[PDB]
Design a binder for this molecule. Structure first.
Ligand SMILES: Nc1nc2c(ncn2[C@@H]2O[C@H](COP(=O)(O)OP(=O)(O)O)[C@@H](O)[C@H]2O)c(=O)[nH]1
Ligand SMILES: [Mg+2]
Length: 166
């Protein structure tokens, strides 16, 4: 069993918790406490290898955490999450990317850009815009819905596959 340490980052309210819960429980939770920050395990076979994913679902601002600090430092890959109907969350991605570059002292860090809430109509962030951002970072862009499960496995398993290239 191979362990992969994943960290889910992004603005409050974009569906970080919902994404993680969908992966773990196969259910959509719409009222997950915005302040609960914790790590979760998922045993799953990815491309023939039995993996134990260790996933930190980050939560909170202008306050420190021993667990989050540890995961930022030792995390092997990052899901950088915005919502396709939250323009500010997309614009925030730059600062999450800069934080990750600083924590790792590198511009070459396993990362996937995730545009969540893709089940809702009238997106305010175009696929093209997100693809452009991911291209500028040299990373994949994957759209997801924690509600319908669209893209959820894709996003997490792609991140594992990105780590394996490192
Ligand atoms: N329709 C829809 N709602 C979502 C999706 N993901 C999250 N939500 C809702 O968006 C809100 C914020 O989700 P949450 O997981 O708490 O975001 P977090 O602050 O990033 O952890 C909640 O009301 C969720 O029900 C999605 O893919 N589709
Ligand atoms: Mg949350």
């Amino acid at each position: 069993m191979t362990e992969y340490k994943l960290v889910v980052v992004g603005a409050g309210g974009v569906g970080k918790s919902a994404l993680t819960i969908q992966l773990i429980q196969n259910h959509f939770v719409d009222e997950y406490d915005p302040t609960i920050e914790d790590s979760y395990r998922k045993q799953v076979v990815i491309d023939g290898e039995t993996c134990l994913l260790d996933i930190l679902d980050t939560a909170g601002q202008e306050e420190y955490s021993a667990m989050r600090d540890q995961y930022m430092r030792t995390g092997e890959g990052f899901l950088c999450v915005f919502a396709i109907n939250n323009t500010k969350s997309f614009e925030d991605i730059h600062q999450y990317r800069e934080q990750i570059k600083r924590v790792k002292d590198s511009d070459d860090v396993p990362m996937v850009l995730v545009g969540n809430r893709c089940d809702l109509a009238a997106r305010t962030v175009e696929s093209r815009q997100a693809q452009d951002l991911a291209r500028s970072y040299g990373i994949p862009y994957i759209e997801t819905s924690a509600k319908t499960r669209q893209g959820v496995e894709d996003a997490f398993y792609t991140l594992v596959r990105e780590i394996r290239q490192h």
